[PDB]
Design a protein around this ligand. Structure first.
Ligand code: ZN
Ligand code: ZN
Ligand code: ZN
Ligand code: ZN
Lengths: 182, 193, 182, 193
DNA sequence: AAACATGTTTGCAAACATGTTT
DNA sequence: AAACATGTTTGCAAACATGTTT
């Protein structure tokens, strides 16, 4: 976590969030509203990039893509702006652009930053996760965590926040049970 | 859509399953249920028995097909996930799409029917070893019977058929196949049902 | 209603039944257990025929078949013993035979009678209704009622009972609301 | 999969909808939304306007197609129910499978593309009546946009195209079509959305 | 037009099916 | 083998979508 010059921050108000576990439990392809908050207007082009990555040191070097099944299953792909391989998708924004790093091969999705609505106090982004946290041939139940980063139009980082994502089928249950381990 | 009725044929063709050890829980068979319960990619020994020497190029084709009427017309291939997954395909020579595989036989040849598009695997028939009453063939089933994007837990059944070197069916036997994780458990539960 | 020599009778213990409305509310293609009770063993071949027919005098002469959509929609038809046109189906009985009257063209389904199980007090039959009570091109929401008849092996009637059938989507709701009209 | 982008073409081709009375609630149009809301089997008057006389056998083809990317590849036909229902077909000469119909024109010819299997209907182009600025064509939409076994409430949109007598596209305009029961209500609600 | 009839969609939890870890 | 992890199926009611009756 790096608040940066604009005191960047992410927060949450079919899914659920354990504040103190910094974990987001949510169903697949369902919509996840995510709250963005700055303290001072970021630069101009300023973008919000959401990138997935494995939590465990063992697997951090491996890119995070959708399992083969979902990747090529008309379902969810057919009529789509985004690439079928990308795990993270953003809904409700034509400007949203999906990117594959030529060198690292890492997939991510950017959305141009925009101040909140008048009176509001949050820039709300709509994220969709397109593979369960357990798809064989994909995450194979390997915990992953999202890295939402506020960057300068040319890719300079201005801030970064991160939470563990676990997209499943019973976020309620899983969260609760995951709360029992303590 | 391929036939599934038992047909002993002129050579009193027959398939059966006899347990390779004396646990060994990698698989199990309900003679009573005509069901074979077995673990994915693990090896299944299947016993072939004739009563009179079959023709010349005689072959044994094993083909998978959905049990229920609603799906019979759909081919049976390996789910997308496994058809790519590095594992089970890396040192393999067999078509990653094919469900049924035979291990321990270089002559084993995999085939996709140009018209029906149905995948199957053949092995040239060879009589038993001296003093032995069974020709044993080693099959491998490459997808759980619940792989999403594949069988999606739709019952399938194997159709092992003894055919003439030019495809004329001399004999056929069928058994339901349910490849899972706990063949022991599943069979048991299936029997308490 | 004609009890007949064997004091024939039908009763009920995804569906529901208004005793005093002689109406059966049940979802489509879902299973309906129906209780048969006699007072004295019926003849030998004795069968139980279930036939649908329109309640309203206006439409009684028109046969009752499944609407065109369902009639030829792989769904529910594909792997099936019974004809895709037949509204009423019985599940759990290989002996069940579906029949189309050559002259009247009327569809119906028979099931060989069998005494109850030991200790039991009912011969229970499993009926499936395969079209909503409202399928356009079919019942077009025209009330129909089932005529379960106990007959002699050669078609002589030994008894007959009948209840109004209304296969819908919310048997609960519909029943309740249908109970409000009074 | 047929194009849906507006293309005025050399003859400044254009389609518009002007209300036949002075209620008449049988249909309505959201110029703003590019959506036509109309009742099944009832008649929809559609205004055609060019700026320069089109070629010779020039025709006006109206073809239906699903709006959403996921279904575009699927043809648009009348649900099974209506394709048989005695009504709307009894005294009719038009293919009971076809969704779009044109009333008041003997020359109107219905067509199924042999390769794509796409159904459409053509009417030879004829200039406006003297003193009139529009060529009016009468369309009929034969299935609610919610017929199960048909559109099953999948948004569709009409592609009226002005073509040369031998199928070369000279102009094309599109509008979303939503045939229902309460065009009034639905349009209103659609606008409050 | 306003009310009513009815199939659908969405959300949710229980009982279950089935691969994985212990 | 026994326990645990997790996707599925089933049932159910609310809010809704949409044809029909009034
Ligand atoms: Zn996946
Ligand atoms: Zn698989
Ligand atoms: Zn129907
Ligand atoms: Zn229709």
């Amino acid at each position: 976590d790096y608040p940066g010059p604009h005191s960047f921050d992410v927060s949450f108000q079919t899914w659920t969030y354990s504040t103190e576990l910094k974990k987001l439990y949510c169903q697949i392809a369902k919509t996840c509203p995510i709250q963005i908050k700055v303290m001072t207007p970021p630069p101009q082009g300023a973008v919000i990039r959401a990138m997935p990555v494995y939590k465990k040191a063992e697997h951090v070097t491996e890119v995070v893509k959708r399992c083969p099944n979902h990747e090529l299953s008309r379902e969810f792909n057919e009529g789509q702006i985004a690439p079928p391989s990308h795990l993270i998708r953003v809904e409700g924004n034509s400007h949203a652009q999906y990117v594959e790093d030529p060198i690292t091969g890492r997939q991510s999705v950017l959305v141009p930053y925009e101040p909140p609505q008048v009176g509001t106090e949050f820039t709300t982004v709509l994220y969709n996760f397109m593979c369960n946290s357990s798809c064989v041939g994909g995450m194979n139940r390997r915990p992953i965590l999202i890295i939402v980063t506020l960057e300068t139009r040319d890719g300079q980082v201005l801030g970064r926040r991160c939470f563990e994502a676990r997209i499943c089928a019973c976020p309620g249950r899983d969260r609760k049970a995951d709360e029992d381990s303590i």
